[PDB]
Design an enzyme around this catalytic site. Sequence first.
Site, PDB file in Angstrom:
ATOM      1  N   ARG A 177      16.981 -35.776 -69.096  1.00  0.00           N
ATOM      2  CA  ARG A 177      16.929 -35.718 -70.364  1.00  0.00           C
ATOM      3  C   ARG A 177      17.992 -35.217 -71.006  1.00  0.00           C
ATOM      4  O   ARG A 177      18.063 -33.871 -71.957  1.00  0.00           O
ATOM      5  CB  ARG A 177      15.706 -35.166 -70.883  1.00  0.00           C
ATOM      6  CG  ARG A 177      14.320 -35.836 -70.156  1.00  0.00           C
ATOM      7  CD  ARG A 177      12.900 -35.001 -70.605  1.00  0.00           C
ATOM      8  NE  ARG A 177      12.989 -33.780 -69.869  1.00  0.00           N
ATOM      9  CZ  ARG A 177      12.769 -33.755 -68.483  1.00  0.00           C
ATOM     10  NH1 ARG A 177      12.452 -34.961 -68.000  1.00  0.00           N
ATOM     11  NH2 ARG A 177      13.098 -32.287 -67.844  1.00  0.00           N
ATOM     12  N   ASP A 242      12.258 -32.183 -61.110  1.00  0.00           N
ATOM     13  CA  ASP A 242      12.193 -32.601 -62.217  1.00  0.00           C
ATOM     14  C   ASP A 242      11.155 -33.875 -62.203  1.00  0.00           C
ATOM     15  O   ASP A 242      11.169 -34.749 -63.249  1.00  0.00           O
ATOM     16  CB  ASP A 242      13.568 -33.156 -62.920  1.00  0.00           C
ATOM     17  CG  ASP A 242      13.249 -33.506 -64.421  1.00  0.00           C
ATOM     18  OD1 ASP A 242      13.533 -34.728 -64.883  1.00  0.00           O
ATOM     19  OD2 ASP A 242      12.613 -32.715 -65.082  1.00  0.00           O
ATOM     20  N   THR A 243      10.387 -34.201 -61.133  1.00  0.00           N
ATOM     21  CA  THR A 243       9.278 -35.173 -61.289  1.00  0.00           C
ATOM     22  C   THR A 243       7.947 -34.770 -61.432  1.00  0.00           C
ATOM     23  O   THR A 243       7.295 -35.272 -62.442  1.00  0.00           O
ATOM     24  CB  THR A 243       9.464 -36.330 -60.353  1.00  0.00           C
ATOM     25  OG1 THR A 243       9.697 -35.701 -58.971  1.00  0.00           O
ATOM     26  CG2 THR A 243      10.889 -37.342 -60.444  1.00  0.00           C
ATOM     27  N   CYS A 348       9.935 -44.842 -53.513  1.00  0.00           N
ATOM     28  CA  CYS A 348       9.983 -43.313 -53.458  1.00  0.00           C
ATOM     29  C   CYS A 348       9.465 -42.669 -52.186  1.00  0.00           C
ATOM     30  O   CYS A 348       8.204 -42.674 -51.912  1.00  0.00           O
ATOM     31  CB  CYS A 348       9.161 -42.684 -54.656  1.00  0.00           C
ATOM     32  SG  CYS A 348       9.129 -40.883 -54.518  1.00  0.00           S
ATOM     33  N   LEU A 349      10.444 -42.046 -51.601  1.00  0.00           N
ATOM     34  CA  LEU A 349      10.111 -41.412 -50.258  1.00  0.00           C
ATOM     35  C   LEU A 349       9.114 -40.136 -50.391  1.00  0.00           C
ATOM     36  O   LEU A 349       8.558 -39.829 -49.369  1.00  0.00           O
ATOM     37  CB  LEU A 349      11.560 -41.108 -49.652  1.00  0.00           C
ATOM     38  CG  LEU A 349      12.304 -42.032 -48.901  1.00  0.00           C
ATOM     39  CD1 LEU A 349      13.878 -41.708 -48.981  1.00  0.00           C
ATOM     40  CD2 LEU A 349      11.879 -42.340 -47.465  1.00  0.00           C
ATOM     41  N   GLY A 350       9.421 -39.629 -51.547  1.00  0.00           N
ATOM     42  CA  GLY A 350       8.642 -38.274 -51.921  1.00  0.00           C
ATOM     43  C   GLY A 350       7.225 -38.521 -52.592  1.00  0.00           C
ATOM     44  O   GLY A 350       6.390 -37.408 -52.858  1.00  0.00           O
TER      45      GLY A 350
END
Length: 405
Positions: A177, A242-243, A348-350
Amino acid sequence: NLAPLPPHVPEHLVFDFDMYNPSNLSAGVQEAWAVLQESNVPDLVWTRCNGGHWIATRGQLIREAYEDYRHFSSECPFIPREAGEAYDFIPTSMDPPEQRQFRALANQVVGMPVVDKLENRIQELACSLIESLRPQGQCNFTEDYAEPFPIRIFMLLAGLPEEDIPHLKYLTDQMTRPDGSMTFAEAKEALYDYLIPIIEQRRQKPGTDAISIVANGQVNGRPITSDEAKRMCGLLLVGGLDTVVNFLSFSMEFLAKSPEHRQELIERPERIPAACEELLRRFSLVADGRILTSDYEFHGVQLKKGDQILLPQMLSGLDERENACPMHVDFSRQKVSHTTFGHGSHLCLGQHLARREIIVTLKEWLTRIPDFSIAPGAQIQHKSGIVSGVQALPLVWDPATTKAV
Ligand code: HEM
Ligand SMILES: C1C2CC3CC1CC(C2)C3
């Protein structure tokens, strides 16, 4: 600030969307983006904002483009171009087959088996933070929970000092952002000034932390380089910080407004997992792209080598062709279709970590504070970018209706 239309773009395909400042942000971020899926908008549009780039507006195109690394390269995944250009994160800025050896490692660090291990701390920290809040009858959820929760867990995982949060979180934020205070390159470099020393130090004296595992990892039968480690770790940080942080706020803003959704979860707990998918579908928040590697014709549109296309993971699940009554949240949908955690080789691995963190927070919050709402006269603002978020989330509750566990 609209960039002149390149020669190859049919004027009928123009639709000036600003990914950084969509038109009716006021009504919500998911809502602001869904304008792109109105009947008047062609499936593939061209915007003159942020230097000119394409946008795929439908689930079908996004999935396709994501699967298609030959045409659509991860080399330059961010818009604007100077951001995609300075972007050198691993495995993100790589295509298969190269992508694959790096992925396998990052997986060692964030994969299932790790979440399995970290479970009890996740559950401990959520309860602790909630219990601590419960008696005040009011917080700033973004700052009071949303941020600390996922951040301290990552600091744990990573073996880094909690003291570094503020400094780190600021740089991560400039990445997704852009504020205007610092360009992508500056942001990237400062994170890098940070990490390097740490990496150096974990090559010499390895720990059990994620950074230690990455720094000394193996890739293509040989040892990862310093620069390579710096680059995977750079990514792990942005994802870490951030996610989950922004997702919880959207979910919580919704819960705070929908008594009946809360209740459903309180009575029929077995539904949490489903609700978690539905929320990920409805409050989906990532939008990155790809670069064209050559001249290619995609669904009748002529794409020129070097064109960037935004392929909003956010949009797939909001698309009516994919989900009936998309803006409505229904915990009992037969098929929750989204691509919140992406699609293709870059999935996405996470994801496992994020799901555990959401499911715990819901279960845990609802348990102690089953009844809450948004503060009177608080106006909730969303922000748009690579990862959208909530600016602040003032909640209020009556302590007397809470429960200690
Ligand atoms: C709400 C939570 C999250 C969402 C919505 C999300 C979304 C995404 C998306 C859409 C991508 C693919 C982007 C692309 O194709 O360019 C991705 C990749 C990635 N994410 Fe997640 N992410 C989240 C949480 C996290 C967390 C907690 C981690 C752990 C640090 C993380 C680590 C990664 C990694 C390592 C990749 C790259 C995989 C690859 O390139 O092969 N993410 N994420
Ligand atoms: C890079 C990719 C897109 C967004 C931002 C950052 C972490 C993760 C993968 C979500």
